[PDB]
Structure formats: structure tokens, C-alpha cells
Amino acid sequence: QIQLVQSGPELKKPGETVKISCKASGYTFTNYGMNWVKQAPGKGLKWMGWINTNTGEPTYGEEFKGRFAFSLETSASTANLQINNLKNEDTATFFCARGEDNFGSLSDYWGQGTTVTVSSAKTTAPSVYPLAPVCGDTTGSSVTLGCLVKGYFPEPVTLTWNSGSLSSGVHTFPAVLQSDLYTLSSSVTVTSSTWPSQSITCNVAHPASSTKVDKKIEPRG
């Protein structure tokens, strides 16, 4: 159906300006205007305004007038947001939705978001460590393995146990920020029969600084 995709999640330090894009698959760009919603980890959903993808008429919600600019690259059926003279207050995830009607009261279809992190912190690639067990009856007929990803900035971090193929049993935790960087954990409970028989592994891509680790969880027991 309509398939709006949005650009990747940027890290821009206070003062700068970021280009955020929405590229319209699915509909005929011109007869349906673009809506832009902000979602802080706070309030919930906020309307920033609409863009009449026909003439380019923009409408901004009060809190948004002036530092924000909805624009389009018509041709590409693309709509862009631009936050200029970036505040750490703008640290959030933005959406382009598609306005069903004139002005965009209903928003049928939303892009996947673009997360901006306004921050002065350094990109520090992670240290990945294989967390493997000392001993013990882990509940019954099962063994958990773990993995810690300490030291990275900024989030995201993509973890995968054995190339994606190892799925059932994972609990990847949220990242948590201790001051300047993030720390992460993921657990995967395998059957007693699967390990160190088979080869469990903690594959880690830090998109942000090209890092990709695959620590193996050697038995060390």
C-alpha cells in the first residue's frame, strides 16, 4: 500500500541542522499532504504541521514556527523536515504521516521514524564481551549464555545470536546510558544438547562507527 520510508537516525551536536526525509511509496504524492509528528520520550504524539504536497503550503504548530522547515523534493516524492540551530531539547523521534484529507486531521499511514540525538558526546565504539556461565542447573535442561555491549555511543546497536538463525530464547535488553555511553545485554537460553556442541555467537554491528564484532561464547567452564 502506501510505504513511506524515512532516513536513518542522526547524532548532531547543539547548534547544527539536520535533514530528515520521508520518501513516498504507494500513493500519488500530489493529492495527499505530509504530516509531521514528534514523539519525545515524554508527552507522546505532537503534531508539528502539514505540507500541502501540491503547492508546497506549510502549516506549523506554534511550538514549531521558525526553527523548523518542512520542504519537499517533489520529484522524488520526498518530504523533508529540517531542524536548524539544534537544541538538546529536540532530542527525539520524528514521523512523517500522510494526511488523509486537506490539512491532515487524520493520518492514515506513518513512516518508520527518524531518531535524532542532539549531543556533544563522542562516538565511542563498544567493547563486546562473551558472558558465559560458571556452572549450575539453569532452571532445567537448558543453559543461558549472555553478551554485554559496554562502551558505545550513540545507540543503535544491532545484536544477533548466530547470524539471526538463533531466535527462540533471546531477550535483548534496552540500552541504558551511564553518563556518556550505553551498556547492553542479551541472553539466549539454549538446550543442554545444543552447547558447546553447536557454536553459539554474539554478532554485534555498531552502525555508527563501523564496528562489527562476533564474539564466540567459548565454554570456559
Binding site: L45, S105, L131, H171, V176, T183, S185, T189
Partner: protein, 214 residues
């Protein structure tokens, strides 16, 4: 500006029940209320506009209701996949104001936490750092309490707890408690105990260690 007000802010029912969620606003918005659902790590989607018209492909089991200032989304047969935030939104006058969301937890049956303690990795030990990770995995309800006691003493600094949100599939919760130290801190001690207070027992769950072969 119209002001979409939601309360409660968390709501729970079991599998197969009904739940109802209150959205009200400042003035008479003439049924022009939209409902979205935003599942954790997903775009919102349009459930309902004009307080009752189901959008393409939302099932019969999500019903719209309301009038004047006062609106209510009712879900029936609460599936495991219905945990998400529900959001209402005015669409009578600009600017379109949204409620603050409501979490739908699916009330499950009780489940004791499967806990696992983990030694500092020799790799981080050459780095001069020591973290003892404990997982407390698949518990129900959300109420866990996780203390460390290094050598029998409540170590309450250095720890960082992380929590999983409710599982879509089995409605449990998991948690991580990493407790970092330095090598000469680690190497000065020897019992390391992760303890867990949880409704599914009296006697505190305890995962404790020091190295030896297995």
C-alpha cells in the same frame, strides 16, 4: 486548542477479555475522534476515525464509541498482541491534539523469575574492569527487586538495571542488572550474590558465585 485527556495511563486485562479506554476533551468535538495504536517499536496505525469507523483491516473486535467531549475505544478478546499504547486525537479543529496514550498490559498468570548470575569476562579483566551480570528472565508480574550483596554486604552502587517491556507472545517480563566494578575491587572480594525479591515466592531467589570448573 482542544485538549485530549486520557486516564488511566496503564490498563490491564487478561487474554480474551474486554477493556475500554477513556479519552475525553475540552469541548464538544462532534465525534471527530481518531484512535491509534502504536505497538512498542512501531509506527502508530489508524484504528478508528469519527469515533466508530474502523479503518481498512482493523478487525471487528475494536469498537468505537463516544459523543460530546467523551470517548471510549473498547477492545474485545484481548489477544496477546494487543499490548501497545492507545492514543486518541481530536480532528474537529486544528491543531489536532492527541491524548497522552494509555498502556494496555495483558494481565497474565503468575510466573517465577528464571535468574542467572555471570562472572566478569577475562577479556574485560585484562581491561582492568569487572562486571557481574545477573539476568532475571521471564517473570510475571512486573514487580522484581534485585539486590547485590558482595561478600554478604548490600552493594548498592555500580548496578544498572534494564528491563524488557511485556512480551507480545507470552506476556512475561525480563530484567538485567549489570554491576560493574574495577579489577582490584573484584579481586578483593569473593562471594557475589544476586538476590531477588518477587511475588512468586517468599524465600528470596538467589544466584551466587565464584569460579571453579564445571
Amino acid at each position: 486548542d482542544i485538549v485530549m485527556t486520557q486516564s488511566p495511563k496503564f490498563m490491564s486485562t487478561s487474554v480474551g477479555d474486554r477493556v475500554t479506554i477513556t479519552c475525553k476533551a475540552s469541548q464538544d468535538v462532534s465525534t471527530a475522534v481518531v484512535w491509534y495504536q502504536q505497538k512498542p517499536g512501531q509506527s502508530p496505525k489508524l484504528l478508528i476515525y469519527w469515533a466508530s469507523t474502523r479503518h481498512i483491516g482493523v478487525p471487528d473486535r475494536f469498537a468505537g464509541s463516544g459523543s460530546g467531549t467523551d470517548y471510549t475505544l473498547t477492545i474485545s478478546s484481548v489477544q496477546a498482541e494487543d499490548l501497545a499504547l492507545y492514543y486518541c486525537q481530536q480532528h474537529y479543529s486544528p491543531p489536532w491534539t492527541f491524548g497522552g496514550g494509555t498502556k494496555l498490559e495483558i494481565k497474565r498468570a503468575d510466573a517465577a523469575p528464571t535468574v542467572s548470575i555471570f562472572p566478569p569476562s577475562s577479556e574485560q579483566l585484562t581491561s582492568g574492569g569487572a562486571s557481574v551480570v545477573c539476568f532475571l528472565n521471564n517473570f510475571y508480574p512486573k514487580d522484581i527487586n534485585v539486590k547485590w550483596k558482595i561478600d554478604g554486604s548490600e552493594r548498592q552502587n555500580g548496578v544498572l538495571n534494564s528491563w524488557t517491556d511485556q512480551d507480545s507472545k507470552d506476556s512475561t517480563y525480563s530484567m538485567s542488572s549489570t554491576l560493574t566494578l574495577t579489577k582490584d575491587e573484584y579481586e578483593r572480594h569473593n562471594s557475589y550474590t544476586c538476590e531477588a525479591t518477587h511475588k512468586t515466592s517468599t524465600s528470596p531467589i538467589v544466584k551466587s558465585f565464584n569460579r571453579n570448573e564445571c
